[PDB]
From a paper:
Upon complement activation, a cascade of proteolytic events generates the complement effectors, including the anaphylatoxins C3a and C5a. Anaphylatoxin signalling through the G-protein coupled receptors (GPCRs) C3aR and C5aR leads to various cellular responses including chemotaxis, oxidative burst, the release of pro-inflammatory molecules and activation of the adaptive immune system. As for C3a, C5a activity is regulated by carboxypeptidases that cleave off the C-terminal arginine residue, producing the C5a-desArg molecule which has a distinct bioactivity pattern and generally a much lower potency than C5a, in part owing to its tenfold to 100-fold decrease in C5aR binding affinity. Here, we have reported the crystal structures of the human C5aR antagonist hC5a-A8 and of the two murine anaphylatoxins mC5a and mC5a-desArg.
To assess whether this property was specific to the human C5a proteins or whether this is a general feature of C5a, we also determined the structures of mouse C5a and C5a-desArg (mC5a and mC5a-desArg) at 1.4 and 2.1 Å resolution, respectively. Both murine proteins fold into a four-helix bundle motif as observed for hC5a. mC5a and mC5a-desArg crystals both displayed P43 symmetry with very similar unit-cell parameters and diffracted to 1.4 and 2.1 Å resolution, respectively. In both structures, the atomic model was traced between residues Asn679 and Ser746, which corresponds to the four-helix bundle core, with helix H1 extending between Asn679 and Tyr694, helix H2 formed by residues Ser697–Arg708, helix H3 encompassing residues Thr714–Val722 and helix H4 comprising residues Gly725–Ser746. The overall fold is also stabilized by three disulfide bridges in both mC5a and mC5a-desArg: Cys702–Cys728 (H2–H4), Cys703–Cys735 (H2–H4) and Cys715–Cys736 (H3–H4). The C-terminus of mC5a and mC5a-desArg (region Pro747–Arg755/Gly754) was not visible in the electron density, again suggesting its high flexibility. Surprisingly, a blob of density that assumed the shape of an arginine was visible in the mC5a structure. This density is observed in the groove between the helix H1 N-terminus and the helix H2 C-terminus of monomer A in the asymmetric unit and is located within hydrogen-bonding distance of Arg743 of the same monomer. Inspection of the crystal packing reveals that this density could represent the C-terminal Arg755 of mC5a from a neighbouring symmetry-related molecule, in which the Cα atom of the last modelled residue, Glu745, is separated by 21 Å from the putative position of this Arg755 Cα atom, a distance that could accommodate a stretch of nine residues assuming a random-coil nonlinear conformation. As expected, mC5a is a full agonist of mC5aR and can activate the receptor with an EC50 of 0.57 ± 0.13 nM.
Residue numbers in the entry: 677 to 746
């Protein structure tokens, strides 16, 4: 299956680029598996704030790429 160590490491690395806790959490949340929707569909649902949205989408994108490169 997908390399979970790698996924965790890359998401940790990205989260470190955000200054504050809420965008870090948004990143982690975007990185969680979702079998039914793409990153664009998922982030379209989130309205917490623009930095949160950016983090969610970027981390979603990173995670899903690692999942598909299994």
């Amino acid at each position: 299956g997908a390399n979970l160590h790698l996924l965790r490491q890359k998401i940790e690395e990205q989260a470190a680029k955000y200054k504050h806790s809420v965008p870090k959490k948004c990143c982690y949340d975007g990185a969680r598996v979702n079998f039914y929707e793409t990153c664009e569909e998922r982030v379209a649902r989130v309205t917490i704030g623009p930095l949160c949205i950016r983090a969610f989408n970027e981390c979603c994108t990173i995670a899903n790429k690692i999942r598909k490169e299994s």
